[PDB]
Structure 1
Amino acid sequence: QVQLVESGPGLVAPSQSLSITCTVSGISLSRYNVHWVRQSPGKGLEWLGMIWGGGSIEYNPALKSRLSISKDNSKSQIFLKMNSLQTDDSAMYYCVSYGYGGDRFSYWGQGTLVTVS
């Protein structure tokens, strides 16, 4: 019933800008915190940022310069934008939520693959 679906660009040329959308259903974003995580075989799992139920936003300090997170409660979508893309940024990008009252405490999305090349 609850689903986190992320959309992305697929392949994208370096020093271009990334832009991903996390489409949520089944829950209210006012009651759940949404994180952005990416995974790759070489790099492992990395925490990018998050946006709390009450709108507060946090970033991976090491990446803040190029990142930008936001949300739209009415459309139940969360956004991530990354600048200065390098081949180094290819990975599976995921949005993950945590909160109380659902069947589960958290829901990990399906992931959207980003192939920078």
Structure 2
Amino acid sequence: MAVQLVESGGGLVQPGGSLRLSCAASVSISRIYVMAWYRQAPGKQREVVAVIRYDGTTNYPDSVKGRFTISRDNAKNTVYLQMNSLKPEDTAVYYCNANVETWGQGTQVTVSS
């Protein structure tokens, strides 16, 4: 019953440039109420970067509006995050989150030469 989430993507890029992260679940995503992406920088606490509900209405924080985009894919159970214009401070470990309780394991993302 306990859903398992697995992430993919990550790694490193240059300042300016896009990337796409994927998060795959054990069941149909269309049953889950909310799903979300979270970001934890070294030396600080977690924070949200995108959420999406069962009806596909999404909320973004003001920090990353226009630069990120979250979407469900119903073909294979996978939620995508698209990161278009990157800054140097957007380097952290990223986590996938089901309803509230269940977490993923995270993927490291870094931006430099």
Q: Deviations 1:54-76 (Å, cap 9, x if unpaired)?
A: 22211112211101110112311
Gaps of 5+ in 1: 99-104
Q: CA deviation at 1:13?
A: 1.0
Gaps of 5+ in 2: none
Q: Paired residue for 1:102?
A: none
CA–CA distance in 1 between the matches of 2:91 and 2:67? 15
Q: Paired residue for 1:52?
A: 53
Give the secondary structure class of the aligned counterpart of 1:62.
Answer: helix
CA–CA distance in 1 between the matches of 2:16 and 2:55? 33
Structure with the largest fraction of strand:
1
Q: Deviations 1:77-97 (Å, cap 9, x if unpaired)?
A: 001111221221110011101
Give the secondary structure class of the aligned counterpart of 1:88.
Answer: coil
Matched residue type, 2:68: L
Structure 2 length-normalised TM: 0.87
Q: Paired residues, what number?
A: 110
Q: CA deviation at 1:52?
A: 0.7
Q: Deviations 1:15-52 (Å, cap 9, x if unpaired)?
A: 01121001111x22122111010101234312111111
Identity between Structure 1 and Structure 2 (%): 49
Matched residue type, 1:113: Q
Q: Which runs of 4+ in 1 moved over 3 A?
A: none
CA shift in 2, pair 1:83/1:111, >3 Å: same
Q: Paired residue for 2:76?
A: 75
Structure 1 length-normalised TM: 0.84
Give the secondary structure class of the aligned counterpart of 1:48.
Answer: strand
Q: In the alignment, is residue 110 of structure 1 matched against residue 105 of structure 2?
A: yes
CA–CA distance in 1 between the matches of 2:54 and 2:68? 19
Q: In the alignment, is residue 65 of structure 1 matched against residue 60 of structure 2?
A: no
